[PDB]
């Protein structure tokens, strides 16, 4: 599972490179497991706008991860508090 661990860490670490600094400053990659990356976002509207174009970001992230290390799904979460 060491190789999975490399890939899981890299998916979290490469999110800023994938989306650029403006979006990265307002989001935080939280968990990657089972192929799904959860990114925390500051509010409901940003989560919606991110979700509507999510495959653009997922495609860039997967190009940075490289063949064999791709993420399958990108989901956005908002804290309730």
* Domain at 2-78: CATH code: 3.30.300.180
User: What is the Cα–Cα distance from 49 to 70, expressed in whole angstroms?
Assistant: 23
Could you tell me the two tokens for 53?
């174009």
User: What is the Cα–Cα distance from 34 to 72, expressed in whole angstroms?
Assistant: 8
Q: At what angle do helices 54-65 and 2-13 cross, to 10 degrees?
A: 130
Q: Where are the domains of the chain?
A: 2-78
Residues 6+ apart with CB under 8 A from 64: 14, 17, 18
Residues 6+ apart with CB under 8 A from 12: 29, 30, 31, 32, 37
Q: What phi and psi, each to the nearest 5 degrees, are found at residue 29?
A: -70, 130
Reduced 3-state DSSP string for the chain: CHHHHHHHHHHHHCHHHHHCHHHHHCEEEEEEECCEEEEEECCHHHHHHHHHCHHHHHHHHHHHHCCCCCCCEEEEEECCC
């Amino acid at each position: 599972k060491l190789g999975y661990g490399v890939q899981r860490a890299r998916a979290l670490l490469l999110w800023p490179q994938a989306v650029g600094p403006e979006i990265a400053r307002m989001t935080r990659p939280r968990s990657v497991q089972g192929g799904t990356l959860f990114v925390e976002v500051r509010d409901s509207a940003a989560a919606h706008h991110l979700t509507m174009q999510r495959h653009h970001f997922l495609k860039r992230l997967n190009e940075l991860l490289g063949a064999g290390q791709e993420v399958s799904e990108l989901r956005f979460s908002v804290g309730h508090i």
